[PDB]
A and B are shown apart, each in its own frame.
With several copies, the nearest count.
Chain A
Amino acid sequence: GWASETAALSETATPQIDRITIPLHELAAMPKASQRLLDDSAFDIETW
């Protein structure tokens, strides 16, 4: 301020800071493959 220091403003309002949390969840997929299908196919399903 300019003239507010004389009347008030004995302290200037500091920035009230705030913490925003990133909870950091996990993204997980678990598809179920058969052992027969994993062995019979010419297509490499394990890498597909």
Chain B
Amino acid sequence: MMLNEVTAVPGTALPVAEFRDHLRLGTGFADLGAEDAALLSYLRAAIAAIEGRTAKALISRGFRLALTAWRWGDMQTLPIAPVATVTALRLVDAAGVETPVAAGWRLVPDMARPRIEALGAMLPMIPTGGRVEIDFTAGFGASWSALPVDLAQAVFLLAAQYYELRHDGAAAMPFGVMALIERWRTVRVLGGRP
């Protein structure tokens, strides 16, 4: 299960022009001077901190989930939560014949537990040695405006914090960064065999 991203964000999809406004608009020094491409490097650091704590995706990037054995008999919960439309469930063998499948499975979308959940009880078996591989597109929307705005504010509360102070310096807000994230974290209570 490597789960590398196929493509990253373009960078032009990120709200750098809006984050300059969350940094100092309506109150402030002026527009002031901010290294523009620096401000893009703190948004990518705040999204990747909230993509990890929430297990969401937020920009709808393309993924590739290549894992060897199916965990359940049929279920296969996908980790990156807001999903849409499996690109392909191609199945490579130990030599690399890469024979895709086009039926036998129906992705059941959900923000809680996205699944693969094949038809009946038969999910495509794995060639011995030949890892299965699932390409999917997971996230809310293509642009920044399609996001839930409370989750978008948790990026701006966090990316501004990485802008305001560089090293790990000390400094309880009601809806802080942490309180806006907790309704998007994954609540799991299984430590068991299934």
Contacts and interface: CB of A to CB of B under 8 A. Distances in A.
Interface of A: 2-8, 11, 13-14, 16-19, 32
Contact of A6 (B91, B120, B121, B122): B91
Most A CB contacts (10 A, CB to CB) among B93, B122, B128, B129 go to B128
A32 B129 CA distance: 14
Interface in B89-115: 91, 93-94, 97, 99
Interface string B73-94: 0000000000000000001011
Contacts of A14: 125
A16 B129 CA distance: 19
A19 B122 CA distance: 8
A3 B129 contact: yes
A6 B124 CA distance: 8
Contacts of B93: 3, 6-7
Contacts, number: 41
Contacts of B97: 7
Contact of B128 (A8, A11, A19): A11
16 contacts: A2-B128, A3-B130, A5-B125, A5-B127, A6-B126, A6-B128, A7-B97, A7-B127, A7-B130, A11-B128, A16-B125, A17-B120, A17-B122, A18-B122, A19-B121, A32-B128
Given A7-B91, A7-B97, A8-B99, A17 B121 contact: yes
A19 B125 contact: no
A41 B172 CA distance: 54
Contacts of B120: 16-19
A25 to B, nearest CB: 19
Given A6-B91, A6-B93, 17 more contacts: A2-B128, A3-B93, A3-B128, A3-B129, A3-B130, A6-B128, A7-B91, A7-B97, A7-B127, A13-B125, A16-B125, A17-B120, A18-B120, A18-B121, A19-B120, A19-B122, A32-B128
Most buried by B among A2, A13, A19: A19
